[PDB]
Amino acid sequence: YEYVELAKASLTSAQPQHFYAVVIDATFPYKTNQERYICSLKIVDPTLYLKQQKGAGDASDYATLVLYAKRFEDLPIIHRAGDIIRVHRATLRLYNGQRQFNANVFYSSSWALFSTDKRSVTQEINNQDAVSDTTPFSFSSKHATIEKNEISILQNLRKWANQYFSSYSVISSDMYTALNKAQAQKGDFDVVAKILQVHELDEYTNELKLKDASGQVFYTLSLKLKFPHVRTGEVVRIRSATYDETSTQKKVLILSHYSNIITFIQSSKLAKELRAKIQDDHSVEVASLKKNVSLNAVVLTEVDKKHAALPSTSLQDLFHHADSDKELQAQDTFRTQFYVTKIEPSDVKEWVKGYDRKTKKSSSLKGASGKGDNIFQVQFLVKDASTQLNNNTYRVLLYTQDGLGANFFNVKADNLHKNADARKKLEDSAELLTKFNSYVDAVVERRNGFYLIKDTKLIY
């Protein structure tokens, strides 16, 4: 196989050509009719990546690749921009001014995906190691072969890809629309925003909280199975989105079956600048707390920085598999999300009891200091997406006698029967926690069959 560069490919030969390129954009593999699937992507290389810079505005130049197949599984799923793709037997032709490569995978064409970063998106999600730096993480047909002479091409293209993404935006301003101008678009458009929050709406749907450089905040629904790489604090490019005119309560973006959410390789200059430039926004949350019914979810808590990298475990696994799963049994500290349905005891004033560290007994402070050290003994009855339909409510404890979750309410324990200020703060918190669309992101430590909240504090 002889590999040609994008800009040097023949437009007249019309013969099958092969090449290596960097994928900067791609749609999701979508079905067009009863027997065809398509995946359109944008590709670049050392000979084609930027338009005549002088009046171009540092706009990225590129060729397009359209892969056709009879099956979904025969097309490449591009989760991240910057990776490399190797195509075989592709015919090139001029399409409205630009070099368009076409390949019928259903016939004799083939593709292979190579990771530019150490690991591929899928490998990072599963914390796996790549067989080698010459092994494709995905490819069409049953087999894929990499000749010795290719290694040089692949390695060099990787070195170039990083230099490219760290030196240029790649996804130039002309490749997407500002969220605060999204309502002015006639149809679909592209977005480049930071993921401020990933809310698990239900068993199969994630609701992303986006905010781009324009400062505008938007929400959009992302299926878990389709986009399992979405992560809070990460910058992504959304291919094809539309402004929802029917959403009056909040700004929402609609995605189609061909829409795609794409992340950037580590060396991405754009992704780096945006991760630091775009700062978290809580305006939406604060405003919703003034309404009796908020269609906007509100994460009332924030876990200690040291746990920010800890993976979340659903209530389903926490209460139904924590004693039968090998992996779950090995852990004593977990992170999870849920919404409070009810708080016990009912009387907020009894949230703080007196504790005798010698007899290991607590008691009401309605009689005063004659009970010992003041501590929180709150029993949350929660539920989550994984247990949304069952007839259960799960108990999550906030017993601070040993220091776990002492500063959860941002209010030091105290006789709530005498300290009006302390009581009022806790009462307001009580209403927020039990309010619809309010959720808690917290770290819990399993102790004698129960889960106690720790290193978790309210941010409202």
């Binding site: 009056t248 349905t341 017993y399 039990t434 004698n448 106690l452």
Partner: protein, 216 residues
């Protein structure tokens, strides 16, 4: 101001404990909607979303009477006008019914609809499943949250708090996590079902039967 007639209607129906007599009267007017599909699923749109209309055995017979030269299962891309319709909540298996969510469904009961044959409608955005809409899904989640929270505050009582001595000095203490599982209501099965709204009931025809009735 909600632009989607369907979204508004279905939303108020839910925010009104499934009581159709409580929903705004200024919304119970004839519904002119575009037919996106007719088989195997009959889906109509209001310009923004699509919903599955449930025709009564009466509605279809009346239709075939006034329009002999018209087959319902062939109204795709055509427009129809529902003069007499009603809404009602129903418990379903969202795993099988894609026009539902959280095992709940708001049905569009059709009693009488005229087929405005060959009427070109204005261009609109691609229609999406209402029960897949972010806001509508959330509205339904609010509905269950209110039902669930009420049921729990009626079922759980006495402040049966875990004895602090259990979570303290747990050096030589082991326990099963399921001990934190509390029943939300007096529901019979393992699925919550303690709702106050009274599940509407009305005989409706399966799109398959109307197919055989027009072509065995």
């Amino acid at each position: 101001q909600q632009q989607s007639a369907f979204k508004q209607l279905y939303t108020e129906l839910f925010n009104n404990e499934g009581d159709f007599s409580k929903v705004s009267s200024n919304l119970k007017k004839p519904l002119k909607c575009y037919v996106k599909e007719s088989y195997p699923h009959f889906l109509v749109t209001d310009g923004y979303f699509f919903v599955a209309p449930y025709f009564t055995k009466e509605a279809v017979n009346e239709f075939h009477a006034k329009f002999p030269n018209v087959n319902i299962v062939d109204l795709t891309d055509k427009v129809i006008v529902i003069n007499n319709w009603s809404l009602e909540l129903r418990r379903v298996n969202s795993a099988e019914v894609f026009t539902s969510y959280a095992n709940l469904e708001a049905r569009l009961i059709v009693h009488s609809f005229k087929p405005n044959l060959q009427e070109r409608l204005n261009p609109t955005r691609y229609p999406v499943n209402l029960f897949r809409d972010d806001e509508f899904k959330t509205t339904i989640q609010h509905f269950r949250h209110t039902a669930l929270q009420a049921a729990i505050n009626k079922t759980v009582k006495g402040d049966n708090l875990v004895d602090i001595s259990k979570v303290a000095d747990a050096a030589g203490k082991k326990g099963k996590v399921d001990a934190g599982i509390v029943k939300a209501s007096a529901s019979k099965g393992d699925e919550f079902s303690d709702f106050s709204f009274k599940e509407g009931n009305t005989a409706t025809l399966k799109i398959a039967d109307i197919f055989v009735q027009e072509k065995g």
